[model samples]
Structures are given as C-alpha cells and as structure tokens.
Target chain A: LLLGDVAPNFEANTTVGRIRFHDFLGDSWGILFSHPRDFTPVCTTELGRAAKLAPEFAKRNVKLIALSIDSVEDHLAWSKDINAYNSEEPTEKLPFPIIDDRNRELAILLGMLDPAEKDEKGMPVTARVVFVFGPDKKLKLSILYPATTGRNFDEILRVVISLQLTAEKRVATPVDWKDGDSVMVLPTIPEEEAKKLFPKGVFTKELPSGKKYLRYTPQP
Target chain B: PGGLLLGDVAPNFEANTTVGRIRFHDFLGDSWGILFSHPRDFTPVCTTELGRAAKLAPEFAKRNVKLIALSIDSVEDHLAWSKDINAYNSEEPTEKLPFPIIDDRNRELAILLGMLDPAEMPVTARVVFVFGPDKKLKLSILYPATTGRNFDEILRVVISLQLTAEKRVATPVDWKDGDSVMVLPTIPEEEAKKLFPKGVFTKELPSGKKYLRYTPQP
Candidate 1:
C-alpha cells in the first residue's frame, strides 16, 4: 500500500473471534503485518517478539494484527507453540489476533504475496509485509522485506513514534531522532509565522546554498 | 519505486554521482547495491543520516553492498554538504565518504523510481532500496517525509540478504550474524540432514507437521 491511500477494509475470523479490519481500528492508528507461514522458524520468533511488546504498542494508541493464509485452527495451535518455546517474556496470550486468510484473498489483494516461497501444498504464501496507518485509516509507511530477512520491531516503533508526533506537530524528526530530540520546522512555515507558532524558538543552520530550509526547534 | 515488486530488476540510469559519471549497472558491477533517497540537501535529517552512513560505510563495504544516495539537489550542494557531514562527526580524510551521493536535481531518476511524496509535494520521501547482486530488488522500505531511515536496520538487512543469498537458511526475527538460522521449509528432512551438517532440530507442534526447523548459522 502507498502512503495516503486508505486501507481496504476486510472482515475475517481471527484467533480472538470475528473482527472487521476498519472497525477494529476505530479511532486509533493501526499496523497490519504478514507472515509467510504459521509454524515457520522465522515467523515464530517474529510473533514472539510482538507478543512481548504488546504493551508498548497499545500505550501509543495503536492496534496491531497479523495475517497469514493458515486456518484459524492452525493459528491457535501455533500460538500455544509460540508461547511455549518462542516468547520468553511469559505473556499468558498474544495481545493481537492472527487473521485467517486461508484462501489467500488478503494476500493477493494487498500485494503481500511472495512468489519465491510456497506452502507445504506448493501454493504461494505471504511475504514479510508491514503497512502502518494513521487514525484516518490512510497508509502512512510500509516496508516489504523478503522471506529470508526478518524485521526489526524497534525500528517499527521508531516510525510509529515519528508518525504520531509529526501528525500533531509542524516539526519533523531529524535522523536517529528519539522522543526527546529536536525536530525540523517544515520549510513551508514562514519565519514570521514560525516565531509565533513555536514559542520554544526556531533556529536555522548556515549553508553554502544560503537556504534557510534547515530550521530546527525543540520537540513539542 | 511505488510498484517495484520484489525480484523486479532495478531500473538502470546514467546520472552524475559524487565520484564521477557512470552508468548505474556498471557502478554496481557484481556487488549488491543500496539506493536511498532524502528530501533535499542540507536538510537536518538527511545531514545527520549522511554522517551516520559515512561512519557505517565500512560495514556496508564488508558486505559488498554499494551505498548510493539520491535527491533533487546539485552535485555542488552534495559536495558542500559532505564537508558538513564530516564536521557533524569530526576528523578529516579518515571521514572520507565511501559511497556516491547521486545528484538527481533534474528529478528524472526520481520519476523513474516514483519516490515523490504526495503529502510533502515534489520533495521525495525517504525510500530505501536493497538490490541483490543481480540487480533485482530484494527488499525495500518507504518512510514518510518526517522519519529518517535507520542505518542499523539497513546494515542488518544487507547482512541478512548476503547471508541468505548463499546459505540455504533464513535469518529468524531479531537475528544477528552468528545467530542460529531457520532452515528453509522447502528443504525436506532427508535433504536438510545433509545440507545443514550443523544438525537440525525440528520444533514439535500440535499440528503434527514437522515444518519448523532450526539450524546453527552455516
């Protein structure tokens, strides 16, 4: 999915029962990720990581869900295995639901299919896909990794924080920007208006190009 | 690019780089390549990122991945900005950047790649492309205008790609080099036994299928 495109809505059976994708999100930001298989080794570790970090995602008013072509039964049994052997944090249950896309409808619809990988039956499976959305349900950011590589959950959280803050503030985060770091003032905001808008004060760096676009202000 | 899928060959181009003028494919040779974009030159996030990338150039080198930076800025702007990046980190020749920061001032390459950000107008968002040795796109990431691309993740992916490219294994979640890797399920038990001499342990599951297998890094 591309940025600003509204996420297509779907209703499917999940580990937690039935859920409509958009309704589950309601007014909160949402993140939907896909795994190639339920019992695969790489997918096992990824689900375990997500299980332990449930609180962190929820605290930011973000809802998380995972998708696969496996049946809900397979997902339920895999959850048991994930808890028993993969997750070390001791969560009673995974905070998010695993969507049942057994027919591969969602995979094809969302462009999550990995042509290189196949299931036990020789059918195509989903790739490592992540689609982050704002409260408005528009796609904000996306990362498409091959089945061979695993994702960094910490980096996903960093983007989540940046998206949340940038949505509310006129300032953008700098490189390696953490929660408390200073942010750049959008160039579109004029100096006259920026002075009144950012009481924290705005600063610009001198460059050979003589451009004043490198404006910075304290994190709001 | 927006619709550039995995396994699709990266579009070739002839553009000026910080080093010199050359065709894109010729620059890549047999090495893997990373083509990433920033909104503009002298922007704070891009500045901080260029410095961080310079510091991590050695990491990319050891993996045989070429780093190419892009934006709608002149080569002169990139040259001036290179000094600023070095100053951000400190020192002199030792800080010489190993990557070529391509000058895409005409936005021709940007149009070919569809890196433009609708929310931020013509200024490109942070788009990262990790191309395999054959120039097929392996992994790609798109971040909105605000967030900076994480260099550690970039290096991690390149390491993962290079490792999995040769081995019959795939890196598990949060996996680093030297960590145990997952044996691809496509490998049957009989074949996996000989392929991974390191020994494969199958994780028993309630489904009664012996699909999840783990092996030490090969």
Candidate 2:
C-alpha cells in the first residue's frame, strides 16, 4: 500500500465481532498494528502496551485496532493474558478490537507478510507492522519492525501529535521536539505574514552564509 | 528488488529532480539525508506530505540533514504540483519549495530500493530512508498511501541516530533530546565513568542486572 491513496476498506471478524474497517474508523484517526500470531512473547507485551495507552490515543481522536494471524477465539483467549500483563490495579479489558487474519487475506493485502519469518507449519506470518491513518482515511505514517524490537507506542503518539499539528498549521516540529517545544517557521513565511501569524514573534538566527532562513517561534 | 535495511549502503543514482539533474550521494555530501517518496504527484495526501517536507526544510538544514523527495512522475508534473503545495500553506510567506523533488519515471530507483508494494499498485509506498553521513541507510519506514508522513518523528529519529553514533549510549523508549540515555553495557563501569563524567547511575532491577545503567544526556 502506498501513502496518499485511499485506505482500502475491508470487513473482518474481530475480537469485538464483525465490523467494517471504514465504519470502525468513522471520523477518527486510525492505527492498525499487526502481530505475527497469537500468544507470542513480543506481541503479548506490545498489545498490552497498546491497551495501556488506549486512553491517551483516544484523547487524540485516534482509534487503535490490532491484527494477528490468529482466529477470533484465539484472540479472545490471548486477550486475558494481555489484560493480566497490563493490569496494575484491576483486569482492564483491551479497549481495541483485534482483527483475526487467520486466512492471511488481510495480511497479504496490506503487505504485512514476513517472507523470512514463519510459524511451525512453515507458513509466513505478518511482520510487526503499524499503520497510522488520518481522519480523512489517508495514511499518515507507517512503521515496520522485526519481532525482536517491540514497538514504542509513545513514539507513535508523538508522531500522531506531530501529524495533527502540522496538518493544521504552517509550522514544523524540530528534532527531539516534544509537544510544547518551539516549532520551526517555514522558510517560505515572509516576515510580514509571520508577524501577524505568530504574535509571539519569529526569531531568525544569523548564519555564516548570510541566509536568514533559520527561524523558530513559540509553538502555536 | 530486495529491500534495503539498516546499516546497508544506500544505492546512489542520477535522476531528474525539480531542481535539475543531480547524483544522489553527491548531493548528500557529508551531511545526513532524508530521502522520502510519494506514490504519485498531485494527489491529496502526497500534496500535503510534500508541503510538510518543504515546510520542514529549515529544520532539516539546521541538523545538517539534506531533504529530498521522490515521486513516480515526470519532472514537469512535480514542478506543477509544487504550486498546489505552496498554495495549501497559503498562510506562509511564499510558496517556494526549499528542497528538490526527484522524478522516478521508470521506477528504477523505487524497485532497486524496494519501495514498491506488490499487493497494491506498482507505485512506491510512502517510504522514508534516513541516510547517515557515511551514506549508509540508518533507518527506514514504510506507510500505505492513505497516511501522511510525520516529519517530527523523522527529526526525532535523526537526533537519536546522531547522538548514539557519537556517544557510547542508546536512547531508551520515547527518548527525547534532554532525556537520560542508557550507557552501553559493553562499556565497563570504570570506562563509562570516564566517558560520562557528568553523571551515571546503575538502576537496581529485579534481576540485579547492573547493566541497566543510565547517564545524563552526553
């Protein structure tokens, strides 16, 4: 799947029951992260983390959906362990739906197959893949990681914040920037427009090459 | 075509870009580079993605990182699309693009770099390849066509890469610039002390692994 194309709508039987992908997304930004299979060590931790971060993702209007090459019954059985892994106070249920891609149809369509990684039956499984889609149903970010490297939901949330912020503004966040950090003013912003747009005022640093392009301003 | 992975040498090629014809690695020179692609030009998501890249040009420059974009279309189309991109950010001062957008007409580079999504259209996915100063691919990200690329996350990864490359440390999960870093276990305690004289503390874990060491950002 390429970026900028309309997200393919599909119907699948999920842990929460049958639902259409587009219908589940509705007007919310969506995140579809896939695990190789059910009851795996790394995926156990990864999906548990997703459950833990459900409130945070919801606050950003992002819906979290999971995928695995396992049956809905398997997903149901494994979710108990996931809840146990994520439980600090009580056994909190997983807030997201886990799509059962046991037939590998969705996995193949989304290009989530791992040619080098296989299961006991020598059948290829899905890679640790994450797809972030904007409210408009356009993909906003994608990540592919090996099973050894657990996905970082914090980084994913950070990217979501950045995408939402930049989509509505003329500024870009800088390196290692947090949500509240100063953002870069686009070089195309004229001094006049910047003055009116950024009431805090834009700061331009003098460079050796006499380029006054290095501009920063308080986050809008 | 086989997909490129971390630590692999970035494939270099010459192609027509919005700025004109130029060789890949040569343009990068000794600076870090972010080579990203859009499936097609004039599309909605890609238009916003390129505009964001153009808008973030200054941020990339400050870190000594060159920003370049690619699309499987003619150079003329890329040039024409820049107007729409600039118009999208009408609030900005000008509509000028700060970086060159490469045209991958024959999909040679896309196929060689393994950016194409076989199950979908033959067009390249929204792939991001972060190249270090050594011209090796340090990181790569793939997104389906419906997603817009996030430059902030890209910038964050670049900072992590630059820092870990210079110091004997690694950023922990969700690590930001000022966050404490984990000292490599390979560095002995005495040696780590000398390297990170600022501060170092070995966290006491349940497993009693003294290697869970932390040091102030170096």
Candidate 3:
C-alpha cells in the first residue's frame, strides 16, 4: 500500500508466541521488518543490531517486531545465532519478537518476496523490507532492498524521529536532516498562519527563482 | 505505478538533462546509474539533497556510477534554480554541479518509471532507483516529503551492491566498507574453500545448518 494506507492486520506465530499483529502494536508506533529466512548470515547481524539498539527504539516510543518466512523453531535457533554473533561483554537475547511467516502469507501480502534469491526448498526469498507505521496504523514509509545489501538503521531511526516530529508540528524535515535542525514550513500553511502556528519565525531562502515556496522554520 | 520489481530492466528513456539530452541506458554505458527524483526544484528538502548529491560526485565516480536527478520543472528552471542549491551549500566550494538534473515537467518519466506518489498528485515523490551496469534495478527507496533521505546510505548501498556483484558475498546489517562479508549460501563448501583464499568459516547453529558462512573481503 502507498503512504496513508492503513496497514492490513493479520495473525501470526512469533518468537514470543502467537500474536494478532495489530493487537501487538496497540498504542505504539510499530516497525515491521523482514529478512529472507533463518540461519542466513546477513539476517543474523541485522537482528543483532536491532537488539543492540533496543533502548534507542524504545525512547522514541517505537516497537520493532521482525518477520521471516521460517518456522518458530528456525526463529528460535536463529535468535541464538544472532545473540551469539553479537556477543557483547554481557550478551542478551534478541530484544524483539520475531514473527514466523513460514507460509509466506505476510511476505506475499506486503510484496516482500525476492524471487531473484531462493531458499533450500527453491522458494523465493523475502527481500530486506521495512514497513514503518504510525500509532494510527497508517503506513508512513516503506523501503524495499534486495538481499545483497544491508540496511542502515541509523537512517531509519532518523526518519522515525522526523515522522514523529512532523506529525506533531506543521513542519517537515530537510535533506540529511537530523533532530535539532531547522525544518520546512508546510506550503499549505500561509505566511500569516505559519507565523502563528510556528511562533518561532519562518525564514525564506532567497532563491534565484524568486519563489517563496522554500520556507524554513525552527523545528517545532 | 505499475509493477517495477527488482531485477527488472529499468525502462530506458530519452529526456532532457542539464548536461543535454541523451538516452538513459546509453548515458549509463559500462557504469552503474543512480536515477533519483525530487518533488520540485528550489524546494527546501530537494535543495539540500541536490547539493549533497553534487558534493558526492567524486565518490560516485570512484564506483563508476553516474548520478542523475529529476523534477517536474523545465530545464531552464532547473538551470536557474541551481544557483540556490549551491548558495545553501556554503560549506563546499561553489563548483559547478557534476551531475545532470533531468527536466521532467511532463511527468512522463515519473509515470513511466513508477516515481509518482499517489498522494503527491501532479508531482513525483522522493524516489531513488539504483541500477547496475546491467541496467537492472537493484534497489529502490521511497520517502514522503516529511522525511529527507540519508545520502550516506545511498553511497553505502552502492558500495554494498558493487562488492556483492563482484564477489560471492552479501553484506550483513549495518555493514560499512571494509567490513567482513558473508559468503553466498549458493556456493557450496568445496567451492567456497577455493574461492575465498582469505578463508571462510561457518557459524555453528543449534539447527546445525551451515548457511551462515563468513569470509573476509576479497
């Protein structure tokens, strides 16, 4: 689905046991990400990194739940691999729940299957996909990456902040924008209106085009 | 908005760019291509993104990759508006931009290439299409106007795609350049032994599957 599309809900088995996906996401922003399958190398590190960054995610009131087209057994065994591979000074099991999509139901529904890569059974592999949804359960952003490349969680975290901030204010982030940077005033809001909406002054960059559409305001 | 899946050949196009008109596939001859689109010219997020991409020209060149940008504006508007793109980029030298900014006022390329955002009506979305030398779309990312893209991730993925294309390996999560890569599971143990002279080791699993193969970068 495109942006603003309400994420479809489903029931599935997870590392934490059976879950109705929507119920698991009640009252919090949720991230639904997928890997190809269990026992994969890239996925091992991916889940580990997600675990390592647990606090960063929680502070934003966001919850992450991973998915794979593998069995609960596979998810458990792979969780062990992920924890072992990322064995810090004092290791902990993966922090999030991993849903088992052995049937590839969610994968097919969300267009996550990457037919270019195959599994031992000759089935398609799930691409490295991320679906970020708001507390209202609307799909905010999505990324479809192939199996060869790894994901940049830093960017994902940055976007999560942007989404939350923009959701609260009438401002959108600029390129390479991180928290604490200035933001763009939504063009829909007039100068008079934005002045009141964003009491922190709107500054327009003097462009050669002479158009005032590029307005900047302190991130509210 | 049709199904343009990965591995599908990126539909070639003939369009006007700041550097002049040329065929898309022809311009990408023997080099990977990063075809990205912004909502419009002289826009805030778009300006920063364009300037950032411009500054990374040498980096893209190092990978034998060509960068092209698109927006629903005339070539002249793009030409005139770039002065603003550079003005905001005071940290870097005010050098001429190295990449072509395609004139996509017609939105023909946007529709043909699946860059149109349904919510964005009459304008393209923030989309990035990375095509290999084969001109196959390797990966695509989409963002709404609310968020700005991380160009560093774009460069990082280019390195990842290039490395995996040349080697029988795939990068792990949060992988950066020079990090140890994982050997392709498709390669059997016997072949992996000879293929990676740097040595390959398998992480033992309780399931006892040996698919988690790690090899030093070749």
Candidate 4:
C-alpha cells in the first residue's frame, strides 16, 4: 500500500531538528522506517543498530529516517539514554534522530497504527516495516518482520545492494548474490547489439530471443 | 547489517508469569523452546492448550527445551485457572505448574509484541513462536480462535528444527521424529561444498539440491 502513495508526506521532529518527508527523501535514496515504541528496552537496541549502521546507509547515498508515536521531549531523553546505556559498550553519541510522533498523526497516515494490530485489551500500536525507495523516488523494497524481534542489518544492506545492481544492469540477482556474484543482464535486446548494450563482456548469455539475452559469470 | 530479520535476536521484555517476574531473556534454553499466547486466561481452547503444554513439559524437557504460555489475564486469573486445569486434566500438581504461565494483565509485553489484535477482539489469537538457542526466531504459527495447537506437532517441530539447524539440512514437508531430511538447497553450491562436504545426500545431484550436514557451532 505504501508504494501506491505518491508525494508521500509526514511531519516529525528529531534531535537535530524538525523533519519533513520531502526533506529526508528529497535529495537521495531513502529508507522510511518505524519501530514499535521509544524508551523501551528492545527499542534501545533497534535505535542503536540503526545509528550504528548510519554510515553504511550513507555510503550508498541512502538516508535513514525513523518515526514513532512518542513526543519530541521523550525522544531527547531516550536518545540520551541510548547513547549512555548501549549494551556492548557505554557511549555518549546517538547516530540518528528519534522523530517525535506524540500525535500519532504520522503513524495514522502511514497505516502503521491499526486496531487489528492490538491485543485482547485493545490498545493500538505500530507494526514493524521498512520501506526503501531509490533516487528516482520509486519504492524498491519493503521488509516486514514481527514486532517481537529486532531487524537484521546485514540483510537490509544485502538487499539494498541487490536492488541497486538490478537497476544499473537492468538484470536480476540470484539469492545470496553479493556485489561480485554473477549478474543477469536483460535478455530483451538484440544479440548483435547486446555487446553495445554491455561492453562488459561475453558475460551475457544468448538465450533464443536473438535480439537479447541474460548475463552470468564467475566473480574475479 | 548486524541484526534485522528472522536471524536476529528476539527482543526481551519484562512481564509477570505464573512463577514470578520473568524477563523475556530468561525464556531461552540450551536446545529449542516455545513461547505461545492464548486468547484469554480462562477460555476453553486456551485451557486445553495450557493443559497439554503442561503435560508435555517432561517430553519437552527430555528434548532439552522449555515452554511458557502467556495471556493478558491477571495473576489471579492464572492462579484460579491452574486449579481447574489440574482438576479437569487429572494430572497431579507437580512441584510447579509445569512451566511459567505469564500474567500480562497490564498488557506490557503483549502490546509491545503486537500479539494482541484489537480488531479481532480485545483478546489475543492463539500464536506460537519457536526460537532456537542462537536467539533467532526460527518459526511462527498463528491460528484463529476456533483452533488450538497440537502439542505432538510442537514436539515434532522442536526435533525437526533442532535437527535441521544442527545438521544444516532441510526437513521434508511433514517431517517427523527421526525421519530422513533433505539437504538445504538454499545456499550456493560453493558455500555448501565448503560447509557440508559429506553426510549430505543431495550433493551429487545437479545444482546441489541435497541437504548438507554441518557440526553445530560450538
């Protein structure tokens, strides 16, 4: 459903300052993600993992934006505690902003806060989801996990790279394919012109179409 | 990325169990384990599941695992129901209630875990999660209100998953105790070759679809 929404917008505030959806996702690729709540223990780990991986996301020119249903005031306090009480080592710096969502307005817009997500006693809450969009502003991937677990960072990085490669070569990547793994080139182009399409090599395999073929090769 | 999906560690929370203030972290055992949620404290389907889970304690323990049940009921509700469970099931009151029954009256852990679905009802659906010793979520089962889980299948899952993860193999559909398992075809051949050279049946097959065997990480 998130992919259907264009010109997506939400108002949030962070430790750095206020946030507009356009501001975060305007310039580069973006990851609009959410956690269950702030100041909770597991959230502590989730925030720390995101902060710790900020540079990794940045390397790919991706901005990591997060939101929750708590107020800006609570965000500040919790950010301080996260910086101080990190499990492996105590630190004093939070890598990213914890946007204030006290109004639940942003959550409601994103379809994050839902009644069906609540338990027997009936308190509404957010489910965990991560949305990745490319520089062209098209939604590329969405990863959903149960709320009880922390997300895996390596997998996100893996899939991000996969998405990037797929876009560049217009090829599909096999499962567990790293940067160097064999890539599949689009087979729709004519064979004679295929070399022109990719001077990269005979890595392109000619399947019956004659005009186009897919690519695969062992890594260097 | 370090932690982000099913392979990542489960988040821990503090909630009241029938035993005491049990932290989610303590639920982990050396082998496999199960943590489940029932709709309410004194319901019929739940009573059966808890009673059956209690009776399976020795079986689960024999397999080197533990089980815990939770609901949004108060400690009072759990206490009252424990008596009814013992009387109805004809099982002797062991030194304990078999395993800790979590009292999530405040919905502290329930709300956090997103276990309770308000749209369905104020109560939770029958949900179960199987976790391995590595702390990652291995499998999850969600059943609607009309159904309850089979404890025999629960034990079979423990044995099957433990065997698979331990051996780096794959279980066939409907795999049971001691049943032969296929090799996992998910990993790349090169990775599989190095990780599981022998004791794998699918190795000789084209594309290496055979199940591989590996020593559990020590």
How many clashes in each structure?
0, 15, 0, 26
lDDT, candidates in the order shown: 0.78, 0.71, 0.79, 0.57
Q: What are the iRMS values of all candidates?
A: 3.0, 9.4, 3.0, 22.4
Model 1 chain B is weakest, by summed lDDT over 10 consecutive residues, at: B116-125
Q: Residue-wise lDDT of candidate 1 within A122-167, one digit each (tens)?
A: 5343356788888898988998887778778888898998888888
Of candidates 2 and 1, the better by TM-score:
1
* Error at A42, model 2, angstroms: 14
Query: Using alpha carbons, what is the TM-score of model 3?
Result: 0.88
Task: Give the top-scoring candidate (TM-score).
Answer: 3
Using TM-score as the measure, what is the rank order of every candidate, best first?
Answer: 3, 1, 2, 4
lDDT of 2 by residue, A79-151 (tens): 7777765654323247999999887778767766543333444333335568888888986667765443345
True-structure lDDT of candidate 1: 0.78
CAPRI-style class, candidate 1: medium
Error (Å) of candidate 2 at residue A216 is 27
Q: Which candidate number maximizes DockQ?
A: 3
Which portions of model 4 show Cα errors greater than 4 Å?
A2-7, A85-93, A115-126, A187-192, A203-214, A217-220, B1-218
Give the i-RMS of model 4 in Å: 22.4
